[PDB]
Amino acid sequence: PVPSRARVYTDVNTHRPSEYWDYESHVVEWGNQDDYQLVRKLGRGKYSEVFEAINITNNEKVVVKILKPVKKKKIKREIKILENLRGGPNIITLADIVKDPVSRTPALVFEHVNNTDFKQLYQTLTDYDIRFYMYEILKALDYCHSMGIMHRDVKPHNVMIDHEHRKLRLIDWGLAEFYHPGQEYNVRVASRYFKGPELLVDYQMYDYSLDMWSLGCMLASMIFRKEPFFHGHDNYDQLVRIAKVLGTEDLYDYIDKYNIELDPRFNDILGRHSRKRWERFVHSENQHLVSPEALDFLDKLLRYDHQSRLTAREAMEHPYFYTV
Amino acid sequence: SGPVPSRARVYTDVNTHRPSEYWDYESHVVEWGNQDDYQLVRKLGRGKYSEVFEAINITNNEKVVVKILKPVKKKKIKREIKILENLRGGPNIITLADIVKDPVSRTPALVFEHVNNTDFKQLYQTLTDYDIRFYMYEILKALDYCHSMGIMHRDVKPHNVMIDHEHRKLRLIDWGLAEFYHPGQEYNVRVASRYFKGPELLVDYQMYDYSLDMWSLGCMLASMIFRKEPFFHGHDNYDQLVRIAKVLGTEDLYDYIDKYNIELDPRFNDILGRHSRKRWERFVHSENQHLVSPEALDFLDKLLRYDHQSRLTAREAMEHPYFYTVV
Ligand SMILES: CCc1ccccc1-c1ccc(CNCCc2nc3cc(Cl)ccc3[nH]2)cc1Cl
Ligand SMILES: CCc1ccccc1-c1ccc(CNCCc2nc3cc(Cl)ccc3[nH]2)cc1Cl
């Protein structure tokens, strides 16, 4: 395939010492978990359990994430990234790194976030609220991309919101990676509905622009009240669902531009599809959230060609955000 | 009717509240891997029933440290392994990477993370007041952590502290004499190296605790800020208490033994004598005055005390004004 590189923050890691990005060589110091009293289970994920806890030294509430150590290199990667981004705008704050004396199970301690339910806001959210919170996500993405990091798992489950205080945090940095120009990455990242075209066609030389496709999927689902926007049933079908909206013409233009060999599994399922107008998704239930500015912005995010999508900085300058 | 009992002021019941698997090292099952993955390079040092080597892990081309143990006491090897496994990953603690045996010899061997030791015999004269505060704080991080984990090191001395000065990295090593703290337990007093033994060991007071490590740390601090190695230069264990008494005085020694109803060995009768309490300022001279300050002397005074209960804990020591200049 034809090589590719990011249009922004291309050489940020190349210009820093190896200590910043060589996570494998990073020395992790595990403190004593006895300073934290577990209160209640908040959620259960893939190789992780989240708990609400109390720090007994200062009587403050914290969040404790207990990791099933299936991959040690992956735990080192998440810790180094969290340490580098610690304190950044709208990034979850790593407070401590601990192990229980008996179990020796790796655990990460974070700042407490008093989140509001996603299925509860849905009925009361205004056009302004969507513009406001989309801008808050963009602050986190322009910051982490400027720090040479791609999140690679942007989705509503990884965005915590405290609506009362109008506070947002981007969480779960377990799939994040350091961007190095010309590097070939694993395509088995992100969650099915938010996976970019480059991942589905096995194009390994991707960048920060992957996060911008995922952000576009979130915006489309919110403005149109259609969750998920691109509803695939497997990784191959996921590309077909995008092809039903963006057309089969631009998909071949994209694969030819980068000389990508299309998997034989796509032969009987891809078919032929026309490029659809964004206004076809407007209905009585969602029209109070749709506008010409919102549709122009969405159109610039959901594009097959990763190089053509708006960067997080370019997105922040769009007329959709003139009111925030 | 015997000596008065004593207990630690901090982390008193940390092992009492944990299941037996954590602290019952005798019942611990050790799995010995194959030493063929490691190629020995050169000898680094030779100790009592142990030889330390620089080695290469042939699977990833990385340098490691291999400690080969002469198996004179099996229970002691199990104790060191369980303690190293419990503290694995803690701040400034040497990291146990593997536990192996050579196929032919079957000699027990421990594999650790690599530490590139700076030779301090020449950089001893380049050390600043800030450097001593910095490295003393690094040792305190290791001690507050191991004490919080219910473990006493019992052999704190310069030989058991490795420093990579270029990267400002410090590690506390050789956990072969370490033990689990249980309140009211009577321990063997034949621990630590002569110059670093606390008065509790010298007067045969067995119910000691984490505070023993704080005396040893005080001996290291005094030898550094005064450029006097060792600070308390005894020729045997009885003479070692006499060297301490020539500095702290004999009045406070009698107050200590009376507090705990300690019976002083008859061997001290003709050698102890009578000694005044010396001011710490008397040890200041032209060659060491650049390392001494009122804050350094107040901190030292609060570690080098006969009464083990009166000494600062590692956490209390970290809050002293001597460390106000360090991160
Ligand atoms: C109007 C914001 C918005 C704009 C566009 C697209 C989507 C959104 C949106 C909607 C909902 C959410 C909230 N999602 C919470 C996920 C979550 N993760 C959790 C983990 C735990 Cl352990 C416990 C509780 C947790 N809760 C966020 C956004 Cl950005
Ligand atoms: C300014 C640090 C400090 C402050 C106060 C008091 C003392 C010190 C201090 C000074 C020097 C050292 C160096 N210690 C190395 C011992 C050592 N042990 C080794 C074992 C082997 Cl196998 C091979 C090589 C080894 N080398 C440490 C301290 Cl804490």
Structure tokens belonging to residue A219 = 């915006």
Q: Are residues B138 and B41 in the same domain?
A: no
Q: Are residues A122 and A210 in the same domain?
A: yes
Per CB-CB distance under 8 Å, the chain A contacts of B319 are: none
β pairing state of B96-101 and B33-34: parallel
Q: Are residues A97 and A35 in the same domain?
A: yes
| Residues pairing with B100 in the sheet | B33, B109
Give every CB contact of residue A155 below 8 A, 6+ residues apart in sequence: A190, A191, A193, A194, A214, A217, A218
Measure CA B192 to chain center.
Answer: 7
DSSP B143: H
The last residue of one of the domains, among B99, B114, B129, is B114
| Cβ B99 vs Cβ B28: under 8 Å | no
Report the phi/psi class of residue B223: left, alpha or beta, with left for phi > 0 and alpha for psi in -120 to 50.
Answer: alpha
Residue B33 annotated in ligand binding: no
Other CB atoms within a 10 A radius of the CB of residue A126 amount to 10
Residues, chain B, total? Answer: 327
In the residue annotation, B155 being an active-site residue is answered as yes
d(CA B156, CA B187): 17
> Which segments of chain A does DSSP mark as H helices, in order?
18-21, 72-85, 118-121, 127-146, 197-200, 209-224, 235-246, 248-257, 292-301, 312-316
The last residue of one of the domains, among A59, A89, A112, is A112
Structural domains counted in chain B: 2
d(CA B301, CA B306): 11
Domain assignment of residue B1, yes or no: no
Q: Are residues B50 and B92 in the same domain?
A: yes
Quick one: which of B46, B83, B49, B52 has its CA closest to B65?
B52
| Cβ B297 vs Cβ B303: under 8 Å | no
Amino acid at B174: D
Domain assignment of residue B178, yes or no: yes
Q: Are residues A48 and A98 in the same domain?
A: yes
Burial class (CB in 10 A: 0-12, 13-18, 19+), A206: buried
Partner A contacted by B90 (CB < 8 A) = yes
Partner A contacted by B148 (CB < 8 A) = yes
Structure tokens belonging to residue B176 = 């072969």
Q: Are residues A47 and A10 in the same domain?
A: no
Structure tokens belonging to residue A127 = 């056009």
Residues, chain A, total? Answer: 324
Phi, psi of A96 (to 5 degrees): -160, 160
Measure CA B123 to chain center.
Answer: 22
Which uninterrupted H or E stretch holds B142? helix B129-148
Per CB-CB distance under 8 Å, the chain A contacts of B314 are: none
Q: Are residues B148 and B51 in the same domain?
A: no
Resolution of the structure in the document, Å: 1.5
Domain assignment of residue B236, yes or no: yes
d(CA A93, CA B174): 36
Give every CB contact of residue A45 below 8 A, 6+ residues apart in sequence: none
| Residues pairing with A167 in the sheet | A162
| Residues pairing with A54 in the sheet | A37, A61
Distance from the CA of A317 to the center of ligand 1, in angstroms? 24
* Distances in whole angstroms, Cα of residue B14 to Cα of each of A32, A80, A130, A280, B151: 12, 31, 50, 66, 10
Which uninterrupted H or E stretch holds B64? strand B62-69
Written in H, E and C, the secondary structure of A172-202 is CCCCCEECCCCCCCCCCCCCHHHCCHHHHCC
| Cβ A72 vs Cβ A105: under 8 Å | no
Contact at CB, A32 and B145, closer than 8 angstroms: yes
DSSP B326: -
Domain enclosing residue B127, as ranges: 6-23+115-327
Residue to substitute in B46, B64, B120, B133 for testing ligand 2 pocket (most ligand atoms within 8 angstroms of CB)? B120
Partner B contacted by A37 (CB < 8 A) = no
d(CA A128, CA A321): 9
Domain assignment of residue B89, yes or no: yes
Residue with tokens 């007994």: A56
Pocket of ligand 1 (CB under 6 A): A 42-43, 50, 115, 118, 125, 129-130, 133-134, 156-157, 159-161, 218-219, 221-222
Q: How many helices (H) and strands (E) does chain A have?
A: 10, 10
Residue with tokens 């079908």: A237
Amino acid at B190: R
d(CA B222, CA B213): 15
Partner B contacted by A30 (CB < 8 A) = yes
Amino acid at B119: D
Nearest CA distance, A103 vs chain B (angstrom): 9
Following DSSP, what letter does each residue of B120-134 receive, concatenated?
HHHHTTT--HHHHHH
Q: Taking every pair of C-alpha atoms in chain A, what is the biggest distance, in angstroms? A: 63
Q: Are residues B81 and B120 in the same domain?
A: no
Q: For A98, which residue in chain B has the nearest alpha carbon?
A: B90
Q: Residues A195, A230, A143, CA angle at the centre, nearest 5°?
A: 45
| Cβ A297 vs Cβ A314: under 8 Å | no
DSSP B79: H
CATH code, domain carrying B279: 1.10.510.10
Contact at CB, A30 and B90, closer than 8 angstroms: yes
CATH code, domain carrying B82: 3.30.200.20
d(CA B285, CA A138): 62
d(CA B205, CA B199): 9
The last residue of one of the domains, among B97, B114, B131, is B114
Q: Are residues A127 and A96 in the same domain?
A: no
Residues that constitute the known binding site of A for ATP: 42-50, 65
Quick one: which of A157, A295, A142 has its CA closest to A219?
A295
Domain assignment of residue B267, yes or no: yes
Q: Are residues B219 and B302 in the same domain?
A: yes
Experimental method: X-ray
Q: Residues A193, A196, A197, CA angle at the centre, nearest 5°?
A: 115
Q: Are residues B61 and B172 in the same domain?
A: no
d(CA A188, CA B165): 42
| Residues pairing with B45 in the sheet | B52
d(CA A37, CA A41): 12
Quick one: which of B28, B219, B233 has its CA closest to B139?
B219
Q: Are residues B181 and B305 in the same domain?
A: yes
Distance from the CA of A160 to the center of ligand 1, in angstroms? 5
